[PDB]
Structure formats: structure tokens, C-alpha cells
Design goal:
Chain K: Its main location: cytoplasm. The structure is cut from a larger assembly and holds 11 copies of chain A. Chain A is of the alpha/beta class and 175 residues long. Chain A contains 7 helices and 7 strands; from the N terminus they run H-E-H-E-H-E-H-E-E-H-H-E-H-E.
Chain lengths: 175, 176, 177, 178, 174, 175, 176, 178, 177, 174, 178
């Protein structure tokens, strides 16, 4: 094991997980695995997910999301550096009241563009619509607004994000 | 040891196994090994197999399946992200009543194309195991063999709900 | 240590060995090492060898076989996925009564091509080849003529057909606790 | 595990962390991870951050900083070899009174120009402008200098000796002996 | 862990650290880390630094030096094989009375050649001058002589080094 | 220049072109370039296209096809070893009466599966339908039959291909 | 010299140029060089530019465009396979009346995202050239600036016929 | 251009082509290209094909053969070093009366087992079966041997000396001197 | 020979030279070589230098410049895409009256960071830097203070703005036969 | 084209070919190609083969030999540096009276060690025996002596080679 | 051949050679080859050597020089960009009266350290000899005392075009178009 993996492992022991890279099937599987592991170890204690990701595939993020909801314990989400696309989604998907943003974090909305191609298109259409739905639900905004803002790649500061409904807190001082 | 391998091992200690990549001989051997290991450690406790695989070779999947059936303990299967081809097969091959799907999981059917031996022999074997795959798939889902082939042919895919209806899984777990 | 190697080691602790790749000198050395180790640790307890191999070199497989026979403990063999060429040989070489096949396992017979001075190599191959046929016949209880004949035409077997032919003694669907 | 990583881990057990390379997302994530870990292990005990870095991206350094402010415990900063750009920022961002400089340390100011993610150049420019202004503001706050002087000095890449740094307001002490 | 790192770690447990390669930012950080660790573990017990290095960047060696002085415990230095440029500097920077040289060690003096280039030049000039000053302080020689000998890359045997003022002892046996 | 390129160049001088690899944008561009070159050099003399390709992307093959039709001179097509997917299409797209098949050539029909994904799907749908149309036109078979046979990956011998309508001749002897 | 380069050179001798890859500084420089070369060789004879490009950088394309306009001779453009982003721009930038499209060519509109200098400056420049691109695109097609931006925004694409109608090209050449 | 390619090209000018490696699609395409070229240049003059190949895929060799039959000119074949599998086939496929063997050439029969394109194994098996049968047929036609003997000898990898090959019917002459 | 190199050579025959990449010692050597070659071939005929470069090292650009001035023939410069840093310098260094800019060309001013003994390198850079500012001022007809000031803030120009500032003498949309 | 290939081609124009590396299928094909080319160009003019090779596979050398005999023109062989195994064979296989050796050339004899292995063994046995036979024919020595000397890897100087029968002349000057 | 090699070759036809990289055995051999070639082609016509080199090995540069002196024709040297160490040496080694410097050229003196590559003692010996020879010849070229050459070489003294002309490295500063 390397130092980085060691720190992440010791953090895992403290029920702290990181999403600091692009969201894909591999990272998703690992993240899902960690959530399942922590859920198995103790289902009563919260899990803290710190996010600094440019986002990625919808399917991967949705797998992560399902695994999050599957976990009985609360999952606190932290916008650490950047939450874009699915990073933003997973951030907002955090347990209500335990979604935090760091003062200079940046939340980006973005409409991802994503076997038989027709089948892939079908699946993508379905899961995309669902993401917009859930995003609207998380933020409490209209779906029309989610889609509209996603289209024009609207981005938010910590404050703007707090206002919009992505997070519940801004950690300006001594968490 | 890496972080990834460490969590997977710690999960293995919790009798949780993952199929998060394409199915081949290597992954099959590893998966079979894990199943045998857990079966050896404790034959009374369930095994949880989480599936997020695009599928792969029939022979590999069948080896996994045999090892699953071989294990005395029940094997609960979870459609986590995507269960395609053999991912779908292994999902449906789980102990009945303990086959789960997550809300946004996707189940894809597909008839594989297969592909140091004579080509004729390989063709023969593939034909056999393919026919057998369809049979077992029909058995798992409770659908007619004709419908399995028909849907497999046109690469039919299912949502979590549609999959539950078709007979791939027994439950859709929103929360645990 | 890797996840895979960890599982194999943890399995080794359960006296379970794997042959999931082509048979060569390296795999042979490794398998033989494992057999000797388990035999050294405890010579009274069985060893379980699970086979999913396309086969390989005769000399390598024969080395494994010799090491198997050398081991005092019984060696139970399981046709897990595929047992081709030396995979089939090592499968059939298991302790009689403890050779198992899983329902969808496939046993393939095949006459290897083999391949120092070429004349010497040829001599050795002829010898070891003949000996393989002999032992294969002995394992299965078939005539040597039938072994060679079937080997020539790359005859393959299902679990049932293999059980009948004499490669294995059981077809196990499920294991008891 | 390597010797280096072993020393860093054993140091981590002593609540001592290092920033000895250029600041980027990976180093930031790792550093933030370490701070969160130490904060989780014990929120009452100080953390010592030793800095010998040429600096780097603003966003990364700000992420480290945000994580520093997040940590309940005090964070003591040490200018070990060189604190340039964000190295200087994170140095000055240390808990007031526990910001140290080694006798021959060098503090360099510098305005990064940023610049390559999967996004529109206009958006990147906007974000950079905001965080840049925020850096200047906080730097001014840390040093107690006017924002104009921070910008002015950053433009001309002003650098400081340990003494000059102490005077300017980057650090509170110059630790010759311990 | 490898054998080498294992031996070095086991040595670290014995409060023995090595400088057996060129001095750069990486080696500096690692060495400084080790010193801080040992200082943290026990501030009363000495640290033994064995040196066999061709030297390197001044800034790095200075970082090491600052960390050395920062450590409360005494730091004994050993010229094991070769102490050149900053190897010599760190050697002479050892706790007075605890600077040792092995019988066939060789001490080399050398003037290293070393953002905007002007700034880098400024800094280098400063640290260079400071390096000469401290070297003079360590050896007890005039600054003029340090520069003079540094210019012509003067080298010393163990005896010549002992005489010059780099080390305090020549230890044939422990 | 290498020997292979030299032979192909000397063949180009004889107005002979080869398609012996997968059809993609690069190969398409090169092939199109060669057709345009030969068309420029002499618009009255035929061009001979020898095909031994596993096929490839529809868009590429359609570009090749357009460039073929664009060329004023007749383009004779030869099924040399294997004409699959677009190899088959380009074979059948040859000038009527000058489409040849070698005795042991093999013609495979196959339905390819193939920016914003929806857009890609749209484009693919259009060009796919068009391919079926043109294929039906070339072979003189119903579109229903083209689609049906394409679906089940029907393959043809030289004789079966001659019967089906892919080619006009089988070169059994001394062309 | 390779076969590919040889045919392209022999084509160059026939005053035929290709844009068959993504547009960047390198390809731009090469293309500009070829245009200047042909213009130098003969300023009275047309140049034929065949386009099969997914597009690319605006700056690169604009450099090509300036070099096109700089050339005294007419430049006929052919949409061979695909003209996206700057491919579409350069297609429409051809001499009016000599802009051709092949029957199954596809024209895609798209507003690029752009991306050793200050980011603010790069943003400024990009804004300028982008606005200019839209202007010239409107000029080429004869469409309103608003419609160009609007369609560019939603990644509108055209068939050969639709492209002819919109104003990208003047003819659809089935046969020559 | 390399020396080797230069010699091969200068040889091509003399209507002499080589098959000195295993037979695959690339070598086949290249060889077919050469035959078509020589046929285009002059359809009245013979082509000399010198063979020293271990053989290879049936489809490739058959493609070469089809291209040979397509060529109007006679194709003289020379067993230079070794003609195995399809090397033997292409050797025997030469124009009758102009099939030569060098004194120490070796002709090996062998039934390839084929086997990895983007297609279904069943289809590949079908195609292979057909072309295999076709090979045996044509081989029998070339040598004037019964199909059963061709299959029988192929099974047991029968090999021939120059004399034995001449007798069997692979070649028409053994060229000691020229 | 490649297609690209062939076109550049064929262009070289037309006395047309390209600067389409960053300015460094290699590109400098190559450009200087080309200039000397064309000057050697014919010293009476103009040389046309087309520029699309992000700039680079001062010393390299100065070497090119010296070689330009060395050439007896006039050197016509064209801002084709971008002329930044030394690209701008070499653009403005063209023969007066023969410095052209294409309509959408962009000229960027920029003060390089430069980067043997460091003190010596610093000295040399200071000298050559000052000299660059001087020559840039001379080319454009602007005050040195204005050049330094604008260089500091990375001022950039459109074709029109550049024509006004004094970098070029013409804005050419189209060329006559 | 490179300088080396250019010189070899220009030599080819002078009907001079080289064997300066180990003998294998590739070198064999190339050499055979060159011989056929020269034979095609002019069947009346000699071909000069200069040999400096450590030898190699028998089958390859035999292919070369067959092609040599096939060529109607005489083939003069030159032992330039070293003729070992099949280098020696091809040397001795030269046209009688036109087999030359340079004063410090060395001729080495050697028994090479060389689908189904049995078949390969059969073929090797055949070609090996044939190689000994032809070698005996070339040198005019008994087959028993060829095998005997081949077994113990006997080597010859230019003189010893001339005496043994490998070459017909030792050319100090042309 | 590439464009760069083509222009250099075309330049070679104009009797113009380049030294635009560090001096080593390979570059030395190539330059020596070029000089010998030009000398062979025409021994009456001058050769123009343009220098933009950071210098390098003494032995290599000395080989170039020996080859320069060997050439009957005059060799004009041009300090194009940088003439350091042996670049400076070869520059000053040009034919007297035909040594030119470009207006912004820079000539750097430097005492090489040589170093290891047989017995170290021999290598040291050889280096000592040739080093002394360099200083001697440099003094001869510039017309300066050897003591001053060594003294200035020691402290890495550098010159502008004017300073170089004054010192004696070159005979002219070519601003205009000769």
C-alpha cells in the first residue's frame, strides 16, 4: 500500500470517503464497495462523502446514488473543491440537512451527452430524464429550471449553491 | 495491497463479492475462487454477489454458475448498475427470493457470438452451452424458451421494474 | 499481495489448489510447490485440485502428476470449467472415487504437438507421449487404442459423457454442509 | 510501503504533514484527506504543516485552505525551504501565532495565470477571476496588508527573506532553535 | 517494503539516517521528514547522520540544515565515503565535537552553479553568500579562504579535513 | 516508400485500387482520394476496385460510395477474399455488369450498430435506412429481404452471391 | 514518401486539397501552406477543397479562412463525408456557386468551447473570434445571426438537401 | 526504400514474385496486388512465383489462388526451400508443366484448423468447412490423387522430398541445373 | 520526404517561409538556415515570411532577426494567424512597407520570463530583453515606455489595432494576380 | 535508402553480393532473391559472393545453395572474415576454381543442432546427412572425416582451409 | 530526407555549414566530413561556418579545428546566436579577417571539465594536454596573453558583439548585408 491509499484507508476507518476524480464504472464500483463496506460495519453511524470531481457518466453516478440510498445510515456530502455534472448530483443527493459546501467550492450544472446505438440512446434518454427529476427533487427547483440551467452550463459559488438548494450549509468556520 | 483490493478483501470478510467487469476466464476463476473460499469458511451463511457487468463469455459465466450452485449456502444477487448478457444470467441465477435489483439498474439480454483447437469442435461446444444457457435462463425467469431466444435476439433491455416483472429478480430494494 | 493471490493463499490454507490456466513449466513448478507444501504441512488431509485449464505441455503436466502421486494425501480433482489435454489428464489422475465433474464442465482429449538437439527432444517426446496414453488408459479404464483414436480426433465430453467414459467418478451439482 | 511513505505516515501519527511539491488537485486531495483524518482522530490537538512548495493552482490551494478552516484544531504552518504562490498563501493561512519561518526560508508572492478542463473558456475565466480576487482578499487579511499592496507585490513577483516575511506579516516567528 | 528501505527503517529506529545520494528537493524533504520524526519521537537523544553524497542544490541543503538546527537534539555527522559541495556543508554543520570522518573519506569543496531568471539569480546570490558565511563559521576559516578554496574545488583527505576544521575526529574504530 | 506502397502505387498507375482493411474515416479518405485522383487523370477509363475487407462504419463507406458515383468513369468491383458489411455494399455498388466475384470469395451481410448521442442516433438511423435502400436497389431484392437477411448475418458463397444479385460475374477462368 | 502522402501530393498537383481530420494549428498550417503554394503556382486556376472533418479550433479555422480569402483563385468546397463546426464553416466559406455537397454528406453546426497566457486574455480573444465566426457564418448562409447562434446552440445538423436549403452549399453533385 | 524491397521490386520488373513467409491476409493482399499488377503490365508473359513459406490461413491462400486463376498469363511455381500447407497448395496450383521443385525443397501437407474475426463462431465454422472441402478438392485436382488420399495424407502431416513430390504430383520437374 | 515537408520545400522554391510553431533554438536554426539559403540562391528577390506562432525564447528570435537583417533581400512578413511575443517581434521586424496582417490575425505583446551560472544567464537576459524592447519600439514607432507598459499587461491587438499601433503596414484581405 | 543499403545496391550493380550475418530464412530469401535477380539480368556474367557469417540454419543455407546451383552463371565465393557452419558450406559450394579466401580468414566446421517435433526431426536428419555429403563432395574429403571434424568443431586458417579443400586460392592481392 | 536536412544539404551546395548544437564526437565527425567534402569538391572557394552552439567536448572541437586547418580553402566563421566554450574557440579559429559576429551574438568563454568515459589517469593526462593546447590556441586567435585567457575562462567571462570584436574573437560585426 502507498501513502495515499493508506490515508484513504485510515479515513475509511473514520467512515470518510472521497470522490476526487472523474466518475466512471471503476470509480463507481470502488465507491459503491466502500459504502457497502461501511454500511456493513456499522449501519447506525453516518458516512461522510467529500467531493472534488469533474463528474462523468450518468449510469455510474446513478449506481453510486442507488448505493447511497441503499445504505441505511445517513450520508453527509461535502463540496470540497469542485462538484460538476454528477459530482453536483451526488452532492445534492446527500442526506437533507447534512449537505455541506466549502466556502470556495464550485458547483457546475451540465447536461451530459453520454451494444446497439439505438438501445444506448433509449437507456440514456430514460436515465437522463430521471437525473433531471431527482436533481429537481434534491434542490427543490422545477424540472424546467434544472433542464434550462443544465443546458447553459450554469455554475454556482458556495453561496449561490446554498441559495439554489444544492447544499444546506457553508462551512465558513471550524465545522 | 491496494486500496481497491483492500476494500474488496474487507468486503470478502463480510461475505460480499463483486462482479464489476466483463466476464472472462480470469475473472471467472477469481470469482469461483472467492465463492469456494467463502463456502469453505462458512457453508451456512449467505453470500452476496453485487453485479455491474457488461457480460462476456458463456463458458466463463457457466463456470461461475456451477460454482454458485456448488456452494451450499444461498447466494443473493444484486443488480447494482448493469447486468448484461452473462451479468443478467448470473443475476437471475441467484437463490430465488434473494435476487435484488437497485432502482436504476438495467438488465440487458443478448445472445453472445462466442468465437488451440479445431473450429468445428469449438462451434459444437458453443452450440451446446448456448442452448443450455437459454434453457437455464428460461428456468430462472419462468419464461418460455422461445421468448428468451426471441428477446435475446433483439437485444431487449429492462428497467428495474420491467426486470422484476419479467422474472430476473424478486425484489427492488430502494432502502435496506 | 493482491486480492487474487490473497484468495488463492486463503484457499491454500483450506487445502484447495487451482489450475485455471495453460500448463507450462512455470505453472507446473508453482503447482508442484503448492502440493509439496500442503503435503508437508499435513500428509493425512486431502488436497482439492480445481481444474479449468486448456491444457499444455506434456512434460509439465507429467511433473505435476508425479508430484501428485508423490503426495501421500489423497488428491481430489474437480472439473470446474474445462479440462483439455493435460487438464483432462490431471483430472483423471485424481484419487479414484474423488474425481468430480460439475454439471457443465467439458473434458477435451487432445494429442499435443510437443515441439538441445531436435532428435533428442523428439525421442523424449515420443517416450513421454506414449506414457501419457498409457496412464490415460489406466485412469479411464479404456483401451490404449481407444485413447489414441479419440485423442487423434479431438473427442470432447460433457459431464455425463465424461462420467461414462471414465474420466471422473461423480457429477456434483451441489455440496453438503 | 516505501521508506518515504513510511516516514510520512509515522509523521502523520505525530500530526505532522508535508507540502513539499507543486500544488495540484491530487496533492490537494491527499493533503485535505490528511487534515480531515487528523481532525477526525483528535480535534483538540494541533496539526503541524511543513511547507516547501513552489505553489500551483489557486483552486487546489483554496481547497486545502477551506479544509484547514474546516478543521477545528489549530494548524501550525512552517516555511521550511520555499513558500511560493499558494505555498505562501497556505503558509500565511496558518493559525495566527503559530505561523513559523525557518531562518533561511524564502517566501515568494506571485499571481498565477491559471488557464484546461472539459468546460467553456468563458466559464473558466469567470471562476478564475472570482477565486483570484478571493485569494488577494484573504492574502491581505492574513498579512494585514492592503489589498492594493498585495496585488502590487504579486505583480512584480516580490520575494522575502525570513525577516522580511516576518515584517510583512506572512509569519509570526522565526524559529532558529527549538 | 524492500530490503534497502527495511534496513534504513531499522536504522531509523536506531536514530541513524543516511545521505547517500545527490542533494535535491526530494532528498531534502525526505531527510527533513526523518529529522523531524526522530526529533518528535525523542528530543533528548542524538541523531546520527552518515554522509556519502556528491552534493547538490544549495537551497535543498539549506532546508536540511535549517531542519538540523531546528532539531533540539544533537546531530552527529559522519563522513562515510564522500562529502562534496553540500555534503561537506552538512557534514561541517554537525554538532561541534560530534563531527566524524572515516579514515579514507574525502571532503570536496565546490561552488555550485545553481519564475523570472532575475529573481532566481537574486535568491541564489543571497543563499550562496550565506552558505559561504556558515561554512566559514563551521570550519573556523576566513570567508575569503572558503571562497578561494571553493573556487578551485579544493579537496581534503580525512586528516586534511580534520586540520581544516570540517570534522572533530577521525574514528578508525567505534 | 515501402514495397507494399510501391506495388499499390504502380497499381494505381494501372487504375487499380485496393480495399483490403477495415472501413474507417482514414481509409475512406485515402480511397476517396485515389478515386478522385484517377478520375482527374482520366475520366474515360474504368477504375478497378478489388475488395477484401471486413467492412466498417456506414458513414465512411457511404463517403466512398458517393465518391464512386461522383466519378464519371465506370468502377468495376471485385470480391477478392471477403466482402462484409460495407465491403459487400461497395461491391454491389459497382457499375452494373462490372461487378465480379472470385470463386472462393465470401460476401457477408451485417447490420452495423454504429457530439450528442441523440444526434448520433438520428444520423445513424437516417444513413442506415438509406444503406438498406441502396443495397436493395443494387441487388434488386426487396428492402424487407435486405433487412431480414442483414439481421441474421446471412452470408453468401460466390455462387450464392451471383444469384442474390451482389455481383454479375464469377471469375472461374482467366478473366 | 508514403502511399497516402503520394496520392495527396499527386492530388495537390491537380490542385485538389483535403481536410479529412480535426482542425488544429498543425493541420491549419499545412492547409494554409498548400493553399499558398497552389496560389503561388497559378493564381488563375481554381482550388478544390474536399472536406470530411469533425471540426475543431476556431482560431485554426479562421487562419485557414483568411488564407482562403487571400488566395486570388476561386476555392471550390466539397462536403464529402462530414462537415462539423469549422468543417461546416470552411465549407460555407467556399467561393459562392462552387460550394458542393455529396448526396449523403452531413453538415453539423456547433459552437466550440475553446479553452502560455492569461486566461482572461484568452477568453477575450475567443469571444471576439466566436462572434466573428457567427457573423461570417450568417453571411455565408444568408441566415440571420440570431438563427445561426440559435441553431449552433442546439447542435442542429443537416442532410445534403437541408444544407442546400439552409445556405451552406450551392449544389448537390450526384454525378460529375 | 530498403535493399530488400529494392531487390523485390527489381525482381518484380523481371516478373518474379516471392512467397517467403506465412500466408495471411496482408501477405495475400500484397501478393494478389503483385499478380494483378504484372497481369496488367503484360498479360502474355509468364509470372514466376518462388515459394519458401510455412503456409497459413486457407482463406488467404485461396484468395491468392483465385487471383492466380484470374491472371491470364501462366504462373510458374518454384518450391525453393519449403512449401507447407498453403505453400504446398499454391505450389501445386501453378500452371501445369511449369511447376518446379528445387533439389532439396520440402513439401509438407497439413490440414489447417483455422479458428477470430468479428463474427459468430457458427458462421466461421461453416465458412471454414466449405473452403476446407474446396481445398481438398482442388489439391486432389492439382496432384491427380484421390480426395481420400489427400485428406488421409493431410491428417498425418505427410511430407515429401523433391523426388517424392514429383512422384506424388505436386510438381512437374526437379530443376538441378538451369 | 513527407507531404508537409514537400509542401514547405516547394514553398521554399517560391521563396516562402513559415513560422507556425513556438520559437526555440531548433526552429531558429532551421529558419536562419532557410533565410541564408534563399539569400544565397538569389539576393535580389524578396523573401516572404508567414507567421502563426505563439512566440518563444528571446535569444532564438533575436538570432532569426539578426539573420533577417543579414539577408540583403527584403523580408516581407505576414501575420497569418497569431503573432505572440517573438512572433510579434519578427512580424514587426519585417521590411517597412512589406509588413502585412490578414483580417483576423491577432498580435499579442508579452514580456518573456527567460530562464552555466545563473548570474551570467540573468545578465545576458537583461541585456537582450532591453534590446528587444528598444527594437520593438523602433519597429512600431512607439515610445519604449509604452512598449514595456503594454508588454507587462499582455496587451493584444486585432489586425486594425495592430495596423494603428505600428506592427504592420497593411491589412490584406485579398491578393492580386 | 541508407548508406549501407546504397553501397550494397551499387555492389549489386557490380554483381557483388554479401553474406555478413547469421543465416536464417529472412537472409536466405534476400540472398536467393539477389541471386535470381542477377541471374535474370545477365546469365553469362559471374556472381561474386563475399562471406563473413557465423552460419545458421541448415534449411536456409540449403535454400541459398539450391538457388546458387540454379543460377546458370558461375558463383565465385570469398571467405572475407569468417565462414562458420553454413558460411563454410556456402563458401565451399562456390564454383570450383573460383573459391577464394583472404589471408586472415577463418573457416569453422560445426554440426548445427536444428509442426510435430517428430516430423521436424525427420527432416533435419535428412538435410543434415545431405549437408555432410555435399560438404564431403565440395572438400573432396571422406564423409567420415567431415562428420568427425564437424563433431569437434574443427577450424582452419586460410592455408589450412586451402589444404583441406574449402577454397582453391588465397588472394593476397586482386 | 527531411526539410531540415534538405536545406542543410542545399546550403552545403552553397558551401555553407552549420554548428547549431552541442559539440560532441558525432557532430564533430559530421562537420569534419562536411569540411573534407567541400575541400574535396573545390579547394579554392571559401567555406562559411555559421555557429550557434553552447560548446562541448574539447577533443571533438579540436578535431573540427584540425580539420579546419587541414582544409586549404579559407573558412569564414559567423557567430550567429551563441558561441560558448568550443563554439567560441571554433569561431576565433576562423580565417583571420573573415571572422564575423552578428549584432546580438554572444560569445562565452568557459573552461571545460572534461570527465570520464580506459584508465582515468590517462584520460586526465590527455585532457591536461589538450586543455593547455586550447588555451594556447585561443590566446593565439585572440592575440591575448595565455594568462588572461585562463583567467577569463575561469570566471566564465562573456562578451557582446562589440566586446568580442574588441577582445579579438572576431574581425567584423556584420549589421548590414555584406
Amino acid at each position: 500500500l502507498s501513502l495515499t491509499d493508506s490515508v484513504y484507508e485510515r479515513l475509511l476507518s473514520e467512515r470518510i470517503i472521497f470522490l476526487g476524480s472523474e466518475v466512471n464504472d471503476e470509480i463507481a464500483n470502488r465507491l459503491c464497495a466502500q459504502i457497502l463496506l461501511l454500511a456493513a460495519e456499522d449501519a447506525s453511524k453516518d458516512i461522510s462523502l467529500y467531493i472534488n470531481s469533474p463528474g462523468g457518466s450518468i449510469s455510474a453516478g446513478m449506481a453510486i446514488y442507488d448505493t447511497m440510498v441503499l445504505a441505511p445510515c445517513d450520508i453527509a456530502t461535502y463540496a470540497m473543491g469542485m462538484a460538476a455534472s454528477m459530482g453536483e448530483f451526488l452532492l445534492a443527493a446527500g442526506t437533507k440537512g447534512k449537505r455541506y459546501a466549502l466556502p470556495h467550492a464550485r458547483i457546475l450544472m451540465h447536461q451530459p451527452l453520454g451494444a446497439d446505438i439505438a438501445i444506448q440512446a433509449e437507456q440514456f434518454a430514460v436515465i437522463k430524464k430521471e437525473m433531471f427529476r431527482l436533481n429537481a427533487e434534491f434542490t427543490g427547483q422545477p424540472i424546467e429550471r434544472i433542464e434550462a440551467d443544465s443546458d447553459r452550463d450554469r455554475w454556482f459559488t458556495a453561496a449561490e449553491a446554498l441559495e439554489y438548494g444544492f447544499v444546506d450549509h457553508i462551512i465558513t468556520r471550524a465545522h
